[PDB]
Structures are given as structure tokens and as C-alpha cells.
Write a protein that binds this ligand. Structure first.
Ligand SMILES: [Mg+2]
Ligand SMILES: [Mg+2]
Ligand SMILES: [Mg+2]
Ligand SMILES: [Mg+2]
Ligand SMILES: [Mg+2]
Ligand SMILES: [Mg+2]
Ligand SMILES: [Mg+2]
Ligand SMILES: [Mg+2]
Ligand SMILES: [Mg+2]
Ligand SMILES: [Mg+2]
Ligand SMILES: [Mg+2]
Ligand SMILES: [Mg+2]
Ligand SMILES: [Mg+2]
Ligand SMILES: [Mg+2]
Ligand SMILES: [Mg+2]
Ligand SMILES: [Mg+2]
Ligand SMILES: [Mg+2]
Ligand SMILES: [Zn+2]
Lengths: 147, 91, 69, 120, 52
RNA sequence: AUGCCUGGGCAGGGCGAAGCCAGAGGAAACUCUGGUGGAGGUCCGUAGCGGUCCUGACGUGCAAAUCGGUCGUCCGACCUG
RNA sequence: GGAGAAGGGUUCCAUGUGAACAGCAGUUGAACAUGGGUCAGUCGGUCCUGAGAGAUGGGCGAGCGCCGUUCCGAAGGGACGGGCGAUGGCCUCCGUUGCCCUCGGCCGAUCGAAAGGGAGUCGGGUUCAGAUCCCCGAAUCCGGAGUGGCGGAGAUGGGCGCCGCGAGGCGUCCAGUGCGGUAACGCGACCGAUCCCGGAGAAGCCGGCGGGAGCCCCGGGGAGAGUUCUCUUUUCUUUGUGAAGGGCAGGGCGCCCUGGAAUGGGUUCGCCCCGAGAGAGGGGCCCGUGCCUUGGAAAGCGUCGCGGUUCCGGCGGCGUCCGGUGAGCUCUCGCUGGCCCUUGAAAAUCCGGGGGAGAGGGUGUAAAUCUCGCGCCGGGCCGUACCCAUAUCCGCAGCAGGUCUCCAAGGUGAACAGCCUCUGGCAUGUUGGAACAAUGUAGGUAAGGGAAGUCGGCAAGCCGGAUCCGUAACUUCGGGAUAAGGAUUGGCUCUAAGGGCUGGGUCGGUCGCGGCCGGCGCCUAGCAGCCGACUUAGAACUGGUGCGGACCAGGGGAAUCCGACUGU
């Protein structure tokens, strides 16, 4: 649990295929991801939840999270608590892909940039009323001095 | 309706915050504090640890789920759609 | 400190190079044989008076056998 | 002076309605009384269970009844156990008599069947 | 009843200022400062909650 | 005055939310009774924090803002180095 | 009352004066004048990093400089293994330095906490003033240890060929970087690099329960003692053992082995657990601050009697004992839960594990010991007095103001409330004497009326605790609510109810009152003995109707307006 962030994070350990060492990354956990689960990332990675792969490979209508705005920026879009992006169409020419953001806007991105399949875990926070000034104070104490 | 008539879990809030707000938060509280059945061991020990974090006492497994419920309907629909797309693509 | 149960170990300790003044306490059936060393004060507890009197003279080098009173 | 007053209180003095400033729970909490009662009743119940006075099922039923504050003290529980044992003994005696009669009748019928087979 | 004081200049009851009562051969109660409670190593697997 | 880091502290009682047990009624849905339980930006109230009234004392004062009674709060948007 | 932090800075101690100050006085002082006093490997700074601050590289800026802390950097000067060269020391053997090859992530120099992290000391005695610092006595941590100071582990096995009655001796082949248990794991050790993994350090708030200790309480034994005009086997004080080791209680385990359970069972105050292995047996591990023992009775304390004109840290007899209890207070340890749209520190430092790059002597020896037991040497620098607050600090002052913490007895009582008392402390707060005029300031009481006073019930008064009854409109169904309104309350003498531990395996035989063997009674409707904490209810009697007798201690109801409320 990351303070100031509704969505939980997941620690994933890889192995570096250049030196004898274990690399560790802190991804944003998607719904259904559990401990002791193998997660794959690459062009040949299969279409499963919590599996990051380029948007060009994924077929149309796929729900993705932590979408890369630019190829190699390591995730910028649809990563708040439960938001997700949907791929609309693919353009083999010029290597372009259309995605629909949770705000409703449609943006054209390169097909090289990757995204994580599934929705962000922890959605539905805004449904519960705060009911108290104290709970709002505790919520905003971990973010900023703006409440 | 043993001790309270129609408040139940939101009886701790007393007369404050309004009737409709307490009624709205009642279902959220019940879902949040309920213990679910873990579909790894078969025991009813799935408990909410944090926002979107669910842990099993026996399996010691942590599952990333919804904020107030173990599974959200949107997540289930997305999982079904992803499985359908995988079957259509890989074949 | 360390307690010694065997008289042979006490005699071996009393003959150490680092051994020092060895004091004898007549504690009215709780006779003590204390040997001062660099690190520990080894104490031998003998419940028999005759054994204590016999062991009094057993010290080879003649250390400070000054009794306690 | 206070020792004499404490002895008087031990016999019971100055403890009336007009010499109590705190509530009944404040002077003696109900939770502690319930805890003592539960511990005493469960202790006696497992003494009886370990002494073969009662079996597993009677022990479990009486444990659940003790948790339901059915018995207010040790004597009531002991007398209820006596009544349960008497009723169980009567039922077991009747069942044993019926079983013996059924076994005798079945053995007689089997003997007659063997006789019929032998005579042919 | 005898009342006792801290034997050091740290007057604040912090984690490092934990004491216990002891009776000396002089028949007086003093403060003895205690070491922190240790913990057994945890398993490298990370799934077992108990300690080794 | 506000944010952050690292420490310390907050008697005794009342009301009695979930959850749980036993008994009774019902064909079921389930419903009553007696217990257990200790939740609450809950209540009385001390320490602490603050300062409503007497427009009291004092008003060349103890004091360039203090004092007495009476007061609000006192497990949290709490008080404090 | 006894001790600290910040602050003060000699205010601390001894002697002397009474010029000035301490709003009177003073033979007194925190005044004045002379001197004296602060003793550390273990107590803290010193080490680490946090929020943050701030260089280099880089950029900007007329310029002093500024921006920024990884960003526009050839950012590590370190290390092992091998080779060469040189000196030094019995150039055997080793150290050092230089060069060559080789290996190598870190993440920004540095600063940043006397309450965060951080190995390791306690007991007695001792000064006019300092003592976990001095002395005495017991320990412990870190670093060094070369020539290894010693012992012990790697260790002294088998086969073969001979000799000898045998023990045993000789020659040769080898093995030998340990051992035990099914298991958890254990045994004083028990090779090992670059590299990699993990743990500790390292975690919020609150509730409940259990264990241990300190204190309090009760029944007694001693020792010293107040009362004794009457009683009281009297009431008051004391009645113990350090750290570090060994052993044993006592707690915890989400540890293991046999086995497979519905007639579901085990179990807590509550929970909860069980074919992913519950009950029943047998083990293992962790904490053991508790008990016994070395320390350690030598010392300390209470008594009784002396040595010595004096100095004199003395000499001696005794005792320092046996038990029980408690929702009792405090500290600590351990389980179990509840809350978060709050998830509750980093680093220094230490350790374990995965691998086998390499070393060893070859059959009595060696390389190694995250060193098994001892033995030797060292631990530098700074602070240490006192006050810590109605007089040593800040407010112009000995100012009713402000200023961060620890220790926390008896009675009454729900209580750390108020009142009285013990240990400890003090003289009533910058002066005393004589009367009790008016006005005052602070407390009260008043016949009859009861707000007629006043802008206004301002002020005061009324109610007040606990037990037993009863409790409306309205409502968001949670509340209102202690609604409102009633009765009781003393003292004495009884009655009833609310619990633990042990006990029968008795007969016969056998062995030394106890143990073993066999069938008996199996208390299975339980009784006998011994203990102990407080409660609840009822009854009689009794006092000049007094009884929450002091203290503690809600005045209510019917409505209008505003703000939801808690909070500022
Ligand atoms: Mg510190
Ligand atoms: Mg005024
Ligand atoms: Mg005036
Ligand atoms: Mg004081
Ligand atoms: Mg002085
Ligand atoms: Mg004067
Ligand atoms: Mg520093
Ligand atoms: Mg079991
Ligand atoms: Mg001092
Ligand atoms: Mg004064
Ligand atoms: Mg006066
Ligand atoms: Mg005076
Ligand atoms: Mg009148
Ligand atoms: Mg008034
Ligand atoms: Mg009302
Ligand atoms: Mg109107
Ligand atoms: Mg308001
Ligand atoms: Zn599970």
C-alpha cells in the first residue's frame, strides 16, 4: 500500500540477463494479481491480466492500464485507482494506434509503447462517503497541505 | 432486528451524518469488513488489509482486488473480455 | 565466577601460572576454596571439614593461603 | 482502627444502600463475574469429562449451554448433569432390553430356519 | 515506600531509557537498564509468518 | 502562523454498534427472549488544553492582560518538547 | 518530597565581616572577602542517517554570487590472484613500496538528533562539598596478537606381509575439511575467495486476557519501642543480595513423529481451529528480568557490650525467619482481536545461507579454525559541582505570570476526585504589636411574601451519589433520557447464595510407612478434610425522622430564530 495513492502497488522480481543478479520493479497492481504469480513482459508475451506487452500486438477492444504516452517512458496513462484505457484501432502504416483515455478523449500513439492488461486494482473508492472532516484530514495529510 | 431495527453496522455513527449517508455507507462497511472465501485454500479467511489489498490468513497470499469488495464487476467483465480476445487471437 | 565440582580441577587451576592469592573460607559446613585468577574466581565447595583440612596443605607453590575471618 | 473497620465490613457493615457512591458495575464489574462463572463451570465440565462421568457429546452440549448462561452456578449445573445421567441411564436400559429381546427373537427365527433346512 | 530516580541524565522515558527494579545487597531498590528484546531470524521464503 | 522529521502524554464511570451463544414460535421466510461483545470525530468528569459569565477582584496591580468562583473540551480536526 | 533536560555559570562547600543590598530587622543569605571543589573503554558527545542544508561537474549572472544535488561529468587511487623490479630485517622466511596483468556498480563531497538507531558495569565503602568516574570486590566489550603462549577440534582407522603366547612393534596401500537423532533439531570447535540471496537493525493507535517482578494487605516468629489511671499475647519500625555464568521452575510456538475424525469434536472473557490433518499420546525450539548455586557473608542492616582522655573508618555475641491472598496500583513480557479513502522512518553496523575459484600434509604431520577453553597488551579527546523553580531560568526584581520529563504509601471513597495521616519538607510566602468605627474584598444566615427588583432571574439559591420503579411529544428509529415524576439510604445482630486444593486403586502376596502385581468398590445421584478474596439479597432490633449527616455531587418543562453536528 502506497501512502497517498489509492491503487496498491506490486513488487515483481526479475533476473537481469546480463549479470548474475535479481532485478526488482515496483509495478501498479492490476485486479486479480496475486502473490506467487508469474508475470511476463515482451513482444511475445501472451494476453493475460497483469501482463505488459506492446499495444500493437494486442487486438482491438483490449482494456489496458499504465499505458505509455511515449515509447520508453515506462507508463504514464490510466494508472490512478481503477481507470483503464481501451485500444480502438491499429494502423500498420506509420506504426500508429488509437486509444481511448478514461477522460473520454481519443489519442493516437505509437505501436511500440507498452501497456499492462487489465484494470487498476482498488477501484470504487469514491463510492464510500467520507462522512467526517477527520477522515478527509487523514486522507489529505498523506498528500499535500491543501484540504 | 435483535438489538437494532434498521441500522445495524452504522449504529456506531449515532444520529450524525444524515440517514441517507449512513444507509449508503452501510453496504460499503458490510462489504469492507466481511470475510470472503479464498479460492486458493477453500477457507473463509480472505480479509481486507488496505485499499484494494486482500490477504488470506491460511494461504498467506495477497490479492489485489477492489476497494470495498473482493471482486468488482468491472474487473470480472474485463477478465472475461480479455479471455475472449486471447482465444480469438491465439486460437 | 565459576564453580568447580571436582577436586582435581581445583588442583589444576591452583597450579596455573596466572594463579594468585587463594583464600579459604570456613563457612560452618559450607567450606569454600577460592582461587583468584586473571578472569575468574574459581570456588570449590567441600561439605566435609576433614577433606578441607587435607586440601589446605595440597597447594604446591605456597601462595597467599591467608584464611578469611 | 481501619483493621477493625475492615473486620466489620468482612462480617458485613457500612455496606448498605446509603454508603455506596459508585454504580453496581463500578464496584463489581459484570464482565469479571461472567469470566469467573464461565471459568468455574468449564473447569467442572472438563473435570467430569476427564473422569468419564460424561462422554464427548454430553460435554459439548453442556459446554454450549454454559455459553448460553443456562446455569447460574455450579450446583444447578451439577443437578442438571445428574438428571441427564438418570434419563440417559433409563433410556439406555430400555434400549438394551429391547436389543436383547430382538437378538433373542432373531436367533430363534434363525434356529427355526436351520431346522427347516435340515428337515427338508 | 521508597521512591527512586533515574541514574543517568536522560529523564525522558524513551525506547533507550527502559529500566527494571532490582534489590541490591544493601537492601535498597535501584534502577537497572535493560537491553532491547531480540528477535529470531525470519525465513527467507517470506510466506511463513513464524520465526525460525 | 503553517508544513515536515524524531520523541513524550492523556484518572474513574454512563449509554451500549457489529459479531457470537442458548431458549421459544414458524411449514418456510425468518421473528421474539435472555446473555456475551466493547464500536463510537459518543456522554459525565480529573490531569492537560482553552477562556462564557460574575461585564467580580485588581486597575500608579502579583502582573505593560494576572487572580477567585463558575465554565467548553477531555481517544481525536487531541496536547506537547 | 527525591532526581534530570534547556537555560544559568560558580549561584556549590568551608571560614570570616556586617560598609552597601535582601522595601522591618538580623548574630542570617543566592551580599561581600578569602580559600576549596567537577577524577570514565562501560554515563553521554564522538559513529549513522531522517526532515533538510550545502560543494564539485554543469548553467546563469555586469558583479559580490546565484540555480541545482545527479542533473549538459574520463566522478571508484580500492582489492584479490599472478609476474617483474628494489630495499629491509639470522636477503631461509616475511613485511613494505613501485610497475604490469586482472577484478570492481552504485548514487554523490560533506554536514544534519547529548529524547531516533548505536557492542560493552555492577555491589559495598568513601568527601565539608565529586563519585555506575575515587578505593575495595567481582565482570564485560572492542582492537592487536607476528615469531602463535598453551591445551583441545582437522586425530591418529582399515586392509595386506611379517615378528611376538598376548599386549604390542615394523614395512606397504590407501581413507580421513567432525559427529548424533525418522523428524523438529542437538553436540565446545567442526577450511574457504570474487559473487549472489536473506535476516536483524526496523516500527501506528486502541481494547481484552494471562505470566513475572516491585509496592500494598493478612496469619505468625524474633529485635528495638509508645501506652499501661481500665483494657489490649499491645500498637509503631525492620526482618536482603548485584552484573556476569551453570541448573531448574513458569510462559509461548503459524515446530516435529504415531493416527485419521459426523453421533462432529477441541476451545476462549471474546475469538478461533480442524482431511491443506482436529482431539489423545511422545518429543523439539525461544524467552526465562522468576527460584537454587559461584559471586556471598568476608560485606550491608537492626539490636546488646566494650578497646581508645583524644586520634582512631575498630573489636565482638546474636538475628537477618515461616506462610496466604487480592477485577488491588506501577513496570515488563506474551497471546488475541478492532480502525484507517490514515498503513504508521532511513542509514551506520552485525549475522546466516547458495556456490566451490583455491590450500594442505601425505600416514604423522600440515593448511584452517564467522575461535572451543584459558593466557598477554591497549582503549586516546571533550562534559561531569550546584539550581532546575511561589528565591540560582525568561518576564527591569527573591515578580500570585511562563517554562520539557521520571519515581508515586495508609484510610474513606467508583476513582491519580475532595478530606485526614506516614516517609520527606516548611514557617504562612518584601515586617510585627494594640483595638474591632464607617466604607470595602471574600464567606454566610434571615420571620411573612416569592422576581412584586432589573433592559434582562445578573448574582445567589434550588436539584445533585447509589439502589429499586417509572419515563411523553417528536424523530434521520440511532436518540430524546439521568426526560419528567416517586420510595430507600445510619448503627447493630443474624440468615441465605456466589469457590479452590487434597483424599478411595481399601484385599492378598511380594520387596524395602512406601513400591510392584490380580480381581475386586470403580464416589461416574458424590462425599470427607483443609483453606481463601470480596460481594449481593433478605430479616429482626435500635437511636429525639437521623442516616449520599463532612467531602464529592445535573435545577427542570413548553416554545420561536440561527447554525446540521464534532472542530476553529
Ligand atoms: Mg540516543
Ligand atoms: Mg471587570
Ligand atoms: Mg483601588
Ligand atoms: Mg524537588
Ligand atoms: Mg550556600
Ligand atoms: Mg532591610
Ligand atoms: Mg553527523
Ligand atoms: Mg493438535
Ligand atoms: Mg549533578
Ligand atoms: Mg517570595
Ligand atoms: Mg495569613
Ligand atoms: Mg512571616
Ligand atoms: Mg426570607
Ligand atoms: Mg446564574
Ligand atoms: Mg427535553
Ligand atoms: Mg415559524
Ligand atoms: Mg456551530
Ligand atoms: Zn487461502
Amino acid at each position: 500500500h502506497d501512502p497517498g495513492r489509492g491503487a496498491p502497488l506490486a513488487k515483481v522480481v526479475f533476473r537481469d540477463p546480463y549479470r548474475f543478479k535479481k532485478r526488482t520493479e515496483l509495478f501498479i497492481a492490476a485486479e486479480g494479481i496475486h502473490t506467487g504469480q508469474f508475470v511476463y513482459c515482451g513482444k511475445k508475451a501472451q494476453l493475460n491480466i497483469g501482463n505488459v506487452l506492446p499495444v500493437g500486438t494486442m487486438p482491438e477492444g483490449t482494456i489496458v492500464c499504465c499505458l505509455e504516452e511515449k515509447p520508453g517512458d515506462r507508463g504514464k496513462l490510466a494508472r490512478a485507482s481503477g481507470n483503464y484505457a481501451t485500444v480502438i484501432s491499429h494502423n500498420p502504416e506509420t506504426k500508429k494506434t488509437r486509444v481511448k483515455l478514461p477522460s473520454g478523449s481519443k489519442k493516437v500513439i505509437s505501436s511500440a509503447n507498452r501497456a499492462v492488461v487489465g484494470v487498476v486494482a482498488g477501484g470504487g473508492r469514491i463510492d464510500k462517503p467520507i462522512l467526517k472532516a477527520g477522515r478527509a484530514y487523514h486522507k489529505y495529510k498523506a498528500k499535500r497541505n491543501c484540504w | 432486528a435483535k438489538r437494532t431495527k434498521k441500522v445495524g453496522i452504522v449504529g456506531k455513527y449515532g444520529t450524525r451524518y444524515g440517514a441517507s449517508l449512513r444507509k449508503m455507507v452501510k453496504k460499503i462497511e458490510i462489504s469492507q469488513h466481511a470475510k470472503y472465501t479464498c479460492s486458493f485454500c477453500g477457507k473463509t479467511k480472505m480479509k481486507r488489509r488496505a485499499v484494494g489489498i486482500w490477504h488470506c490468513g491460511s494461504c498467506m497470499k495477497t490479492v489485489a482486488g477492489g476497494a470495498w469488495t473482493y471482486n468488482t464487476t468491472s474487473a470480472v467483465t474485463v477478465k472475461s473480455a480479455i479471455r475472449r480476445l486471447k482465444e480469438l487471437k491465439d486460437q | 565466577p565459576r564453580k568447580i565440582e571436582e577436586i582435581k580441577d581445583f588442583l589444576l587451576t591452583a597450579r596455573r601460572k596466572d594463579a594468585k592469592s587463594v583464600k579459604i573460607k570456613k563457612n560452618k559446613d559450607n567450606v569454600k576454596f577460592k582461587v583468584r585468577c586473571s578472569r575468574y574466581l574459581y570456588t570449590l565447595v567441600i561439605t566435609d571439614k576433614e577433606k578441607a583440612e587435607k586440601l589446605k596443605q595440597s597447594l604446591p607453590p605456597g601462595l597467599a593461603v591467608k584464611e578469611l575471618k | 482502627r481501619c483493621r477493625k473497620n475492615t473486620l466489620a465490613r468482612r462480617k458485613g457493615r457500612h455496606m448498605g444502600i446509603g454508603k455506596r457512591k459508585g454504580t453496581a458495575n463500578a464496584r463489581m464489574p459484570e464482565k469479571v463475574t461472567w469470566m469467573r462463572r464461565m471459568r468455574i463451570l468449564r473447569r467442572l465440565l472438563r473435570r467430569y469429562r476427564e473422569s468419564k462421568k460424561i462422554d464427548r457429546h454430553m460435554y459439548h452440549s453442556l459446554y454450549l449451554k454454559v455459553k448460553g448462561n443456562v446455569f447460574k452456578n455450579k450446583r444447578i449445573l451439577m443437578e442438571h448433569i445428574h438428571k441427564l445421567k438418570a434419563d440417559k441411564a433409563r433410556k439406555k436400559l430400555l434400549a438394551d432390553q429391547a436389543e436383547a429381546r430382538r437378538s433373542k427373537t432373531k436367533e430363534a427365527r434363525k434356529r427355526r430356519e436351520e431346522r427347516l433346512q435340515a428337515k427338508k | 515506600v521508597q521512591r527512586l530516580t533515574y541514574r543517568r541524565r536522560l529523564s525522558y522515558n524513551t525506547a533507550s531509557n527502559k529500566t527494571r527494579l532490582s534489590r541490591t545487597p544493601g537492601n535498597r531498590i535501584v534502577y537497572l537498564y535493560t537491553k532491547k528484546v531480540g528477535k529470531a531470524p525470519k525465513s527467507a521464503c517470506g510466506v511463513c509468518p513464524g520465526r525460525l
